């Protein structure tokens, strides 16, 4: 009802923008490094298998 | 005798191949592989049981 103290729509936009920016940063790191998996947070099992293969 | 020596060397090489070739620490051709299932479907119930005889 045109409340001025809080802006829920702004909060939703902020959260979605933060998610988009995080995805952009992760994809940009993947593109620059040339390796899809760069940290355990990405994929633990894949990281272990790939390191063993290397 | 020389031909037999060469043949024995080749036999030892065959044993080495059977006991060495591995995929990330998984011996493949020494008979330990057995029959292993590989999921190739979205749900449960679809797999191709691959087997490698020693």
């Amino acid at each position: 009802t045109i409340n001025v103290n809080t802006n829920v729509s702004a909060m939703t936009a902020q959260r979605y923008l933060t998610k988009a920016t995080g995805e952009l940063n992760t994809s940009m790191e993947r593109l620059s490094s040339g390796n899809r998996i760069n940290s355990a947070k990405d994929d633990a099992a894949g990281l272990q298998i790939s390191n063993r293969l290397t | 005798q020389a031909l037999n020596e060469e043949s024995v060397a080749l036999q030892d090489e065959l044993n080495r191949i059977a006991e060495t070739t591995s995929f990330g620490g998984r011996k493949l051709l020494n008979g330990s592989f057995g029959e292993a299932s590989f999921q190739i479907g979205s749900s449960s119930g679809e797999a191709i049981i691959m087997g490698l005889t020693s």
Side-chain angles (χ1 to χ4, degrees):
Chain A
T1 84
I2 320 107
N3 53 299
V4 75
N5 214 17
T6 67
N7 202 355
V8 52
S9 65
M11 260 159 224
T12 313
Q14 267 176 92
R15 212 112 178 205
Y16 274 110
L17 165 59
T18 287
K19 186 176 296 186
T21 310
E23 301 284 344
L24 162 61
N25 268 349
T26 291
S27 148
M28 225 157 53
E29 164 187 310
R30 285 176 178 172
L31 261 181
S32 34
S33 80
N35 289 312
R36 184 183 69 111
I37 273 153
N38 308 303
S39 179
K41 278 269 158 196
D42 288 13
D43 183 6
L47 178 45
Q48 209 176 304
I49 308 321
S50 155
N51 273 323
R52 200 154 65 224
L53 288 191
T54 281
Chain B
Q1 193 303 339
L3 298 176
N4 166 46
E5 286 308 310
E6 191 164 338
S7 84
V8 164
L10 272 309
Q11 278 175 292
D12 287 9
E13 185 68 0
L14 244 178
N15 282 128
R16 192 224 63 113
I17 274 177
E19 289 296 345
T20 283
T21 81
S22 168
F23 182 62
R26 174 87 145 136
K27 304 300 182 305
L28 300 147
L29 273 42
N30 86 26
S32 83
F33 198 56
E35 311 301 294
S37 294
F38 282 63
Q39 182 70 232
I40 56 157
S42 67
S43 65
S44 65
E46 312 88 340
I48 48 144
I49 49 181
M50 219 192 267
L52 302 186
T53 57
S54 70

PDB file of all heavy atoms in Angstrom, chain B residues 8-43:
ATOM      1  N   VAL B   8      58.713 -65.726 -23.748  1.00  0.00           N
ATOM      2  CA  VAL B   8      58.499 -65.562 -22.314  1.00  0.00           C
ATOM      3  C   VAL B   8      58.462 -64.085 -21.950  1.00  0.00           C
ATOM      4  O   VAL B   8      57.664 -63.657 -21.106  1.00  0.00           O
ATOM      5  CB  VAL B   8      59.584 -66.314 -21.523  1.00  0.00           C
ATOM      6  CG1 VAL B   8      59.613 -65.842 -20.078  1.00  0.00           C
ATOM      7  CG2 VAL B   8      59.343 -67.810 -21.594  1.00  0.00           C
ATOM      8  N   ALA B   9      59.329 -63.282 -22.568  1.00  0.00           N
ATOM      9  CA  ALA B   9      59.265 -61.842 -22.342  1.00  0.00           C
ATOM     10  C   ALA B   9      57.911 -61.287 -22.766  1.00  0.00           C
ATOM     11  O   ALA B   9      57.307 -60.477 -22.051  1.00  0.00           O
ATOM     12  CB  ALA B   9      60.393 -61.140 -23.096  1.00  0.00           C
ATOM     13  N   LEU B  10      57.413 -61.721 -23.925  1.00  0.00           N
ATOM     14  CA  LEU B  10      56.104 -61.263 -24.380  1.00  0.00           C
ATOM     15  C   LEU B  10      55.003 -61.704 -23.421  1.00  0.00           C
ATOM     16  O   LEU B  10      54.045 -60.963 -23.178  1.00  0.00           O
ATOM     17  CB  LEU B  10      55.826 -61.781 -25.792  1.00  0.00           C
ATOM     18  CG  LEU B  10      56.314 -60.938 -26.978  1.00  0.00           C
ATOM     19  CD1 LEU B  10      55.860 -59.496 -26.860  1.00  0.00           C
ATOM     20  CD2 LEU B  10      57.822 -61.001 -27.124  1.00  0.00           C
ATOM     21  N   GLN B  11      55.113 -62.919 -22.883  1.00  0.00           N
ATOM     22  CA  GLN B  11      54.133 -63.402 -21.914  1.00  0.00           C
ATOM     23  C   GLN B  11      54.125 -62.530 -20.667  1.00  0.00           C
ATOM     24  O   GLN B  11      53.060 -62.177 -20.140  1.00  0.00           O
ATOM     25  CB  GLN B  11      54.448 -64.849 -21.541  1.00  0.00           C
ATOM     26  CG  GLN B  11      53.929 -65.876 -22.518  1.00  0.00           C
ATOM     27  CD  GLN B  11      54.371 -67.276 -22.159  1.00  0.00           C
ATOM     28  OE1 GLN B  11      55.553 -67.607 -22.240  1.00  0.00           O
ATOM     29  NE2 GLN B  11      53.425 -68.104 -21.744  1.00  0.00           N
ATOM     30  N   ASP B  12      55.312 -62.191 -20.165  1.00  0.00           N
ATOM     31  CA  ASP B  12      55.388 -61.317 -19.002  1.00  0.00           C
ATOM     32  C   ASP B  12      54.788 -59.954 -19.316  1.00  0.00           C
ATOM     33  O   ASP B  12      54.128 -59.347 -18.466  1.00  0.00           O
ATOM     34  CB  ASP B  12      56.838 -61.181 -18.540  1.00  0.00           C
ATOM     35  CG  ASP B  12      57.348 -62.432 -17.851  1.00  0.00           C
ATOM     36  OD1 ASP B  12      56.642 -63.460 -17.882  1.00  0.00           O
ATOM     37  OD2 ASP B  12      58.456 -62.387 -17.276  1.00  0.00           O
ATOM     38  N   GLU B  13      55.004 -59.459 -20.535  1.00  0.00           N
ATOM     39  CA  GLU B  13      54.380 -58.201 -20.937  1.00  0.00           C
ATOM     40  C   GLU B  13      52.862 -58.319 -20.946  1.00  0.00           C
ATOM     41  O   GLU B  13      52.157 -57.384 -20.554  1.00  0.00           O
ATOM     42  CB  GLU B  13      54.884 -57.777 -22.314  1.00  0.00           C
ATOM     43  CG  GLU B  13      54.387 -56.411 -22.766  1.00  0.00           C
ATOM     44  CD  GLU B  13      54.965 -55.273 -21.947  1.00  0.00           C
ATOM     45  OE1 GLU B  13      55.759 -55.544 -21.023  1.00  0.00           O
ATOM     46  OE2 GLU B  13      54.622 -54.105 -22.227  1.00  0.00           O
ATOM     47  N   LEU B  14      52.341 -59.450 -21.420  1.00  0.00           N
ATOM     48  CA  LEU B  14      50.895 -59.649 -21.414  1.00  0.00           C
ATOM     49  C   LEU B  14      50.352 -59.637 -19.993  1.00  0.00           C
ATOM     50  O   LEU B  14      49.310 -59.030 -19.721  1.00  0.00           O
ATOM     51  CB  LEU B  14      50.537 -60.962 -22.107  1.00  0.00           C
ATOM     52  CG  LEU B  14      49.709 -60.841 -23.385  1.00  0.00           C
ATOM     53  CD1 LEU B  14      49.472 -62.211 -23.981  1.00  0.00           C
ATOM     54  CD2 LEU B  14      48.386 -60.147 -23.113  1.00  0.00           C
ATOM     55  N   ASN B  15      51.045 -60.307 -19.073  1.00  0.00           N
ATOM     56  CA  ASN B  15      50.617 -60.284 -17.678  1.00  0.00           C
ATOM     57  C   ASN B  15      50.667 -58.869 -17.114  1.00  0.00           C
ATOM     58  O   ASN B  15      49.761 -58.447 -16.385  1.00  0.00           O
ATOM     59  CB  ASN B  15      51.486 -61.224 -16.845  1.00  0.00           C
ATOM     60  CG  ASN B  15      51.103 -62.679 -17.016  1.00  0.00           C
ATOM     61  OD1 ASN B  15      51.948 -63.525 -17.301  1.00  0.00           O
ATOM     62  ND2 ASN B  15      49.823 -62.980 -16.831  1.00  0.00           N
ATOM     63  N   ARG B  16      51.721 -58.121 -17.444  1.00  0.00           N
ATOM     64  CA  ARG B  16      51.827 -56.746 -16.972  1.00  0.00           C
ATOM     65  C   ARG B  16      50.674 -55.899 -17.490  1.00  0.00           C
ATOM     66  O   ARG B  16      50.102 -55.095 -16.747  1.00  0.00           O
ATOM     67  CB  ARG B  16      53.165 -56.148 -17.404  1.00  0.00           C
ATOM     68  CG  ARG B  16      53.499 -54.832 -16.728  1.00  0.00           C
ATOM     69  CD  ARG B  16      54.048 -53.822 -17.719  1.00  0.00           C
ATOM     70  NE  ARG B  16      53.073 -53.469 -18.746  1.00  0.00           N
ATOM     71  CZ  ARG B  16      52.510 -52.275 -18.887  1.00  0.00           C
ATOM     72  NH1 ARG B  16      52.788 -51.272 -18.070  1.00  0.00           N
ATOM     73  NH2 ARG B  16      51.643 -52.081 -19.876  1.00  0.00           N
ATOM     74  N   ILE B  17      50.322 -56.060 -18.765  1.00  0.00           N
ATOM     75  CA  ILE B  17      49.181 -55.332 -19.312  1.00  0.00           C
ATOM     76  C   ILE B  17      47.909 -55.725 -18.577  1.00  0.00           C
ATOM     77  O   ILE B  17      47.106 -54.870 -18.190  1.00  0.00           O
ATOM     78  CB  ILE B  17      49.061 -55.584 -20.827  1.00  0.00           C
ATOM     79  CG1 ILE B  17      49.947 -54.598 -21.593  1.00  0.00           C
ATOM     80  CG2 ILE B  17      47.603 -55.472 -21.278  1.00  0.00           C
ATOM     81  CD1 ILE B  17      49.967 -54.813 -23.093  1.00  0.00           C
ATOM     82  N   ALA B  18      47.709 -57.024 -18.363  1.00  0.00           N
ATOM     83  CA  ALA B  18      46.493 -57.476 -17.701  1.00  0.00           C
ATOM     84  C   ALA B  18      46.387 -56.904 -16.294  1.00  0.00           C
ATOM     85  O   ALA B  18      45.283 -56.631 -15.809  1.00  0.00           O
ATOM     86  CB  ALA B  18      46.454 -59.003 -17.663  1.00  0.00           C
ATOM     87  N   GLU B  19      47.522 -56.716 -15.622  1.00  0.00           N
ATOM     88  CA  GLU B  19      47.530 -56.307 -14.224  1.00  0.00           C
ATOM     89  C   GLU B  19      47.751 -54.814 -14.012  1.00  0.00           C
ATOM     90  O   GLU B  19      47.686 -54.358 -12.866  1.00  0.00           O
ATOM     91  CB  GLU B  19      48.609 -57.082 -13.464  1.00  0.00           C
ATOM     92  CG  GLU B  19      48.290 -58.549 -13.259  1.00  0.00           C
ATOM     93  CD  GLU B  19      47.075 -58.758 -12.381  1.00  0.00           C
ATOM     94  OE1 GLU B  19      46.653 -57.793 -11.711  1.00  0.00           O
ATOM     95  OE2 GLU B  19      46.543 -59.887 -12.359  1.00  0.00           O
ATOM     96  N   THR B  20      48.007 -54.039 -15.065  1.00  0.00           N
ATOM     97  CA  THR B  20      48.368 -52.634 -14.908  1.00  0.00           C
ATOM     98  C   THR B  20      47.301 -51.675 -15.411  1.00  0.00           C
ATOM     99  O   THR B  20      46.891 -50.777 -14.670  1.00  0.00           O
ATOM    100  CB  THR B  20      49.693 -52.349 -15.629  1.00  0.00           C
ATOM    101  OG1 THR B  20      50.781 -52.843 -14.840  1.00  0.00           O
ATOM    102  CG2 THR B  20      49.879 -50.853 -15.850  1.00  0.00           C
ATOM    103  N   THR B  21      46.849 -51.828 -16.655  1.00  0.00           N
ATOM    104  CA  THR B  21      45.915 -50.869 -17.237  1.00  0.00           C
ATOM    105  C   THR B  21      44.771 -50.581 -16.276  1.00  0.00           C
ATOM    106  O   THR B  21      44.029 -51.482 -15.877  1.00  0.00           O
ATOM    107  CB  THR B  21      45.364 -51.376 -18.575  1.00  0.00           C
ATOM    108  OG1 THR B  21      44.300 -52.308 -18.345  1.00  0.00           O
ATOM    109  CG2 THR B  21      46.457 -52.002 -19.440  1.00  0.00           C
ATOM    110  N   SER B  22      44.641 -49.310 -15.904  1.00  0.00           N
ATOM    111  CA  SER B  22      43.679 -48.890 -14.900  1.00  0.00           C
ATOM    112  C   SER B  22      43.108 -47.539 -15.297  1.00  0.00           C
ATOM    113  O   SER B  22      43.715 -46.787 -16.062  1.00  0.00           O
ATOM    114  CB  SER B  22      44.325 -48.812 -13.512  1.00  0.00           C
ATOM    115  OG  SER B  22      43.485 -48.140 -12.594  1.00  0.00           O
ATOM    116  N   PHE B  23      41.925 -47.242 -14.768  1.00  0.00           N
ATOM    117  CA  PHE B  23      41.239 -45.973 -14.999  1.00  0.00           C
ATOM    118  C   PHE B  23      41.100 -45.283 -13.646  1.00  0.00           C
ATOM    119  O   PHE B  23      40.106 -45.467 -12.940  1.00  0.00           O
ATOM    120  CB  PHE B  23      39.885 -46.190 -15.663  1.00  0.00           C
ATOM    121  CG  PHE B  23      39.155 -44.918 -15.978  1.00  0.00           C
ATOM    122  CD1 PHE B  23      39.692 -43.996 -16.859  1.00  0.00           C
ATOM    123  CD2 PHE B  23      37.932 -44.643 -15.396  1.00  0.00           C
ATOM    124  CE1 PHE B  23      39.023 -42.826 -17.151  1.00  0.00           C
ATOM    125  CE2 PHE B  23      37.258 -43.474 -15.685  1.00  0.00           C
ATOM    126  CZ  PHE B  23      37.805 -42.564 -16.563  1.00  0.00           C
ATOM    127  N   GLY B  24      42.102 -44.486 -13.289  1.00  0.00           N
ATOM    128  CA  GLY B  24      42.092 -43.789 -12.020  1.00  0.00           C
ATOM    129  C   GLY B  24      42.135 -44.724 -10.829  1.00  0.00           C
ATOM    130  O   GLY B  24      41.368 -44.561  -9.877  1.00  0.00           O
ATOM    131  N   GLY B  25      43.027 -45.710 -10.872  1.00  0.00           N
ATOM    132  CA  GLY B  25      43.169 -46.661  -9.791  1.00  0.00           C
ATOM    133  C   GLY B  25      42.244 -47.855  -9.862  1.00  0.00           C
ATOM    134  O   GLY B  25      42.271 -48.691  -8.950  1.00  0.00           O
ATOM    135  N   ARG B  26      41.431 -47.965 -10.908  1.00  0.00           N
ATOM    136  CA  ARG B  26      40.517 -49.087 -11.091  1.00  0.00           C
ATOM    137  C   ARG B  26      41.136 -50.055 -12.093  1.00  0.00           C
ATOM    138  O   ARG B  26      41.162 -49.778 -13.296  1.00  0.00           O
ATOM    139  CB  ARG B  26      39.155 -48.592 -11.574  1.00  0.00           C
ATOM    140  CG  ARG B  26      38.161 -49.691 -11.931  1.00  0.00           C
ATOM    141  CD  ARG B  26      37.364 -50.153 -10.725  1.00  0.00           C
ATOM    142  NE  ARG B  26      35.997 -50.505 -11.094  1.00  0.00           N
ATOM    143  CZ  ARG B  26      35.350 -51.585 -10.677  1.00  0.00           C
ATOM    144  NH1 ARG B  26      35.908 -52.456  -9.851  1.00  0.00           N
ATOM    145  NH2 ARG B  26      34.107 -51.798 -11.099  1.00  0.00           N
ATOM    146  N   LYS B  27      41.627 -51.190 -11.601  1.00  0.00           N
ATOM    147  CA  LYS B  27      42.133 -52.221 -12.496  1.00  0.00           C
ATOM    148  C   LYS B  27      41.005 -52.724 -13.384  1.00  0.00           C
ATOM    149  O   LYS B  27      39.921 -53.059 -12.899  1.00  0.00           O
ATOM    150  CB  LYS B  27      42.734 -53.374 -11.692  1.00  0.00           C
ATOM    151  CG  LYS B  27      43.833 -52.960 -10.723  1.00  0.00           C
ATOM    152  CD  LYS B  27      45.002 -52.308 -11.443  1.00  0.00           C
ATOM    153  CE  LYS B  27      46.122 -51.947 -10.481  1.00  0.00           C
ATOM    154  NZ  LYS B  27      45.647 -51.091  -9.360  1.00  0.00           N
ATOM    155  N   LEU B  28      41.260 -52.781 -14.688  1.00  0.00           N
ATOM    156  CA  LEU B  28      40.231 -53.096 -15.671  1.00  0.00           C
ATOM    157  C   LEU B  28      40.317 -54.509 -16.220  1.00  0.00           C
ATOM    158  O   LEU B  28      39.289 -55.178 -16.340  1.00  0.00           O
ATOM    159  CB  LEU B  28      40.306 -52.111 -16.843  1.00  0.00           C
ATOM    160  CG  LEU B  28      40.104 -50.630 -16.527  1.00  0.00           C
ATOM    161  CD1 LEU B  28      40.953 -49.777 -17.451  1.00  0.00           C
ATOM    162  CD2 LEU B  28      38.641 -50.250 -16.646  1.00  0.00           C
ATOM    163  N   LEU B  29      41.515 -54.986 -16.557  1.00  0.00           N
ATOM    164  CA  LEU B  29      41.677 -56.209 -17.331  1.00  0.00           C
ATOM    165  C   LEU B  29      42.321 -57.337 -16.531  1.00  0.00           C
ATOM    166  O   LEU B  29      42.848 -58.283 -17.121  1.00  0.00           O
ATOM    167  CB  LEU B  29      42.499 -55.917 -18.587  1.00  0.00           C
ATOM    168  CG  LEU B  29      41.720 -55.426 -19.809  1.00  0.00           C
ATOM    169  CD1 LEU B  29      40.662 -54.411 -19.423  1.00  0.00           C
ATOM    170  CD2 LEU B  29      42.675 -54.840 -20.830  1.00  0.00           C
ATOM    171  N   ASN B  30      42.296 -57.262 -15.202  1.00  0.00           N
ATOM    172  CA  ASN B  30      42.805 -58.339 -14.363  1.00  0.00           C
ATOM    173  C   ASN B  30      41.693 -59.193 -13.767  1.00  0.00           C
ATOM    174  O   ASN B  30      41.964 -60.023 -12.895  1.00  0.00           O
ATOM    175  CB  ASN B  30      43.726 -57.763 -13.273  1.00  0.00           C
ATOM    176  CG  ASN B  30      42.987 -57.301 -12.018  1.00  0.00           C
ATOM    177  OD1 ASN B  30      41.904 -57.772 -11.685  1.00  0.00           O
ATOM    178  ND2 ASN B  30      43.600 -56.361 -11.307  1.00  0.00           N
ATOM    179  N   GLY B  31      40.453 -59.013 -14.220  1.00  0.00           N
ATOM    180  CA  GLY B  31      39.339 -59.812 -13.761  1.00  0.00           C
ATOM    181  C   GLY B  31      38.595 -59.257 -12.568  1.00  0.00           C
ATOM    182  O   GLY B  31      37.541 -59.797 -12.211  1.00  0.00           O
ATOM    183  N   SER B  32      39.103 -58.198 -11.938  1.00  0.00           N
ATOM    184  CA  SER B  32      38.436 -57.622 -10.778  1.00  0.00           C
ATOM    185  C   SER B  32      37.252 -56.748 -11.159  1.00  0.00           C
ATOM    186  O   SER B  32      36.400 -56.476 -10.306  1.00  0.00           O
ATOM    187  CB  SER B  32      39.427 -56.797  -9.956  1.00  0.00           C
ATOM    188  OG  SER B  32      39.565 -55.492 -10.491  1.00  0.00           O
ATOM    189  N   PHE B  33      37.179 -56.303 -12.414  1.00  0.00           N
ATOM    190  CA  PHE B  33      36.116 -55.387 -12.809  1.00  0.00           C
ATOM    191  C   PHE B  33      34.748 -56.040 -12.678  1.00  0.00           C
ATOM    192  O   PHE B  33      33.788 -55.402 -12.230  1.00  0.00           O
ATOM    193  CB  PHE B  33      36.348 -54.908 -14.241  1.00  0.00           C
ATOM    194  CG  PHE B  33      35.593 -53.660 -14.593  1.00  0.00           C
ATOM    195  CD1 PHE B  33      35.747 -52.508 -13.845  1.00  0.00           C
ATOM    196  CD2 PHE B  33      34.733 -53.637 -15.675  1.00  0.00           C
ATOM    197  CE1 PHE B  33      35.056 -51.360 -14.166  1.00  0.00           C
ATOM    198  CE2 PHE B  33      34.039 -52.491 -16.001  1.00  0.00           C
ATOM    199  CZ  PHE B  33      34.201 -51.352 -15.246  1.00  0.00           C
ATOM    200  N   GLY B  34      34.636 -57.307 -13.062  1.00  0.00           N
ATOM    201  CA  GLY B  34      33.354 -57.973 -12.977  1.00  0.00           C
ATOM    202  C   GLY B  34      32.329 -57.305 -13.872  1.00  0.00           C
ATOM    203  O   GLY B  34      32.643 -56.770 -14.939  1.00  0.00           O
ATOM    204  N   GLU B  35      31.077 -57.336 -13.428  1.00  0.00           N
ATOM    205  CA  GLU B  35      29.970 -56.694 -14.126  1.00  0.00           C
ATOM    206  C   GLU B  35      29.542 -55.472 -13.327  1.00  0.00           C
ATOM    207  O   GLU B  35      29.073 -55.604 -12.192  1.00  0.00           O
ATOM    208  CB  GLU B  35      28.798 -57.659 -14.303  1.00  0.00           C
ATOM    209  CG  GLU B  35      29.188 -59.010 -14.875  1.00  0.00           C
ATOM    210  CD  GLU B  35      29.853 -58.898 -16.230  1.00  0.00           C
ATOM    211  OE1 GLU B  35      29.178 -58.474 -17.191  1.00  0.00           O
ATOM    212  OE2 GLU B  35      31.051 -59.233 -16.335  1.00  0.00           O
ATOM    213  N   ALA B  36      29.700 -54.291 -13.919  1.00  0.00           N
ATOM    214  CA  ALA B  36      29.380 -53.033 -13.262  1.00  0.00           C
ATOM    215  C   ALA B  36      28.265 -52.327 -14.017  1.00  0.00           C
ATOM    216  O   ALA B  36      28.288 -52.249 -15.248  1.00  0.00           O
ATOM    217  CB  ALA B  36      30.610 -52.126 -13.180  1.00  0.00           C
ATOM    218  N   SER B  37      27.292 -51.810 -13.273  1.00  0.00           N
ATOM    219  CA  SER B  37      26.161 -51.109 -13.860  1.00  0.00           C
ATOM    220  C   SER B  37      26.502 -49.641 -14.067  1.00  0.00           C
ATOM    221  O   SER B  37      27.225 -49.040 -13.268  1.00  0.00           O
ATOM    222  CB  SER B  37      24.927 -51.233 -12.967  1.00  0.00           C
ATOM    223  OG  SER B  37      24.481 -52.575 -12.892  1.00  0.00           O
ATOM    224  N   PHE B  38      25.980 -49.070 -15.148  1.00  0.00           N
ATOM    225  CA  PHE B  38      26.153 -47.657 -15.462  1.00  0.00           C
ATOM    226  C   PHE B  38      24.781 -47.042 -15.690  1.00  0.00           C
ATOM    227  O   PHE B  38      24.052 -47.463 -16.594  1.00  0.00           O
ATOM    228  CB  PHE B  38      27.035 -47.468 -16.697  1.00  0.00           C
ATOM    229  CG  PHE B  38      28.500 -47.627 -16.424  1.00  0.00           C
ATOM    230  CD1 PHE B  38      29.009 -48.834 -15.985  1.00  0.00           C
ATOM    231  CD2 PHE B  38      29.368 -46.567 -16.600  1.00  0.00           C
ATOM    232  CE1 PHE B  38      30.356 -48.982 -15.732  1.00  0.00           C
ATOM    233  CE2 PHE B  38      30.715 -46.708 -16.346  1.00  0.00           C
ATOM    234  CZ  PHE B  38      31.210 -47.918 -15.912  1.00  0.00           C
ATOM    235  N   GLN B  39      24.432 -46.051 -14.876  1.00  0.00           N
ATOM    236  CA  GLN B  39      23.150 -45.379 -15.029  1.00  0.00           C
ATOM    237  C   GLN B  39      23.153 -44.537 -16.298  1.00  0.00           C
ATOM    238  O   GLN B  39      24.048 -43.712 -16.504  1.00  0.00           O
ATOM    239  CB  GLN B  39      22.866 -44.505 -13.810  1.00  0.00           C
ATOM    240  CG  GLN B  39      21.526 -43.790 -13.848  1.00  0.00           C
ATOM    241  CD  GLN B  39      20.354 -44.735 -13.692  1.00  0.00           C
ATOM    242  OE1 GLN B  39      19.428 -44.729 -14.502  1.00  0.00           O
ATOM    243  NE2 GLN B  39      20.383 -45.550 -12.645  1.00  0.00           N
ATOM    244  N   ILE B  40      22.154 -44.750 -17.152  1.00  0.00           N
ATOM    245  CA  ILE B  40      22.016 -43.985 -18.386  1.00  0.00           C
ATOM    246  C   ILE B  40      20.579 -43.504 -18.540  1.00  0.00           C
ATOM    247  O   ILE B  40      20.161 -43.116 -19.636  1.00  0.00           O
ATOM    248  CB  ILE B  40      22.453 -44.815 -19.606  1.00  0.00           C
ATOM    249  CG1 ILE B  40      21.675 -46.131 -19.673  1.00  0.00           C
ATOM    250  CG2 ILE B  40      23.942 -45.092 -19.545  1.00  0.00           C
ATOM    251  CD1 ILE B  40      21.617 -46.723 -21.063  1.00  0.00           C
ATOM    252  N   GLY B  41      19.812 -43.533 -17.450  1.00  0.00           N
ATOM    253  CA  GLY B  41      18.422 -43.142 -17.494  1.00  0.00           C
ATOM    254  C   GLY B  41      18.096 -42.140 -16.404  1.00  0.00           C
ATOM    255  O   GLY B  41      18.808 -42.009 -15.410  1.00  0.00           O
ATOM    256  N   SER B  42      16.989 -41.427 -16.616  1.00  0.00           N
ATOM    257  CA  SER B  42      16.561 -40.422 -15.649  1.00  0.00           C
ATOM    258  C   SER B  42      16.142 -41.069 -14.336  1.00  0.00           C
ATOM    259  O   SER B  42      16.588 -40.659 -13.259  1.00  0.00           O
ATOM    260  CB  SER B  42      15.412 -39.598 -16.229  1.00  0.00           C
ATOM    261  OG  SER B  42      14.248 -40.390 -16.385  1.00  0.00           O
ATOM    262  N   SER B  43      15.284 -42.082 -14.406  1.00  0.00           N
ATOM    263  CA  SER B  43      14.781 -42.756 -13.221  1.00  0.00           C
ATOM    264  C   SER B  43      15.665 -43.962 -12.906  1.00  0.00           C
ATOM    265  O   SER B  43      16.741 -44.141 -13.481  1.00  0.00           O
ATOM    266  CB  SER B  43      13.322 -43.159 -13.425  1.00  0.00           C
ATOM    267  OG  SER B  43      13.202 -44.131 -14.448  1.00  0.00           O
TER     268      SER B  43
END
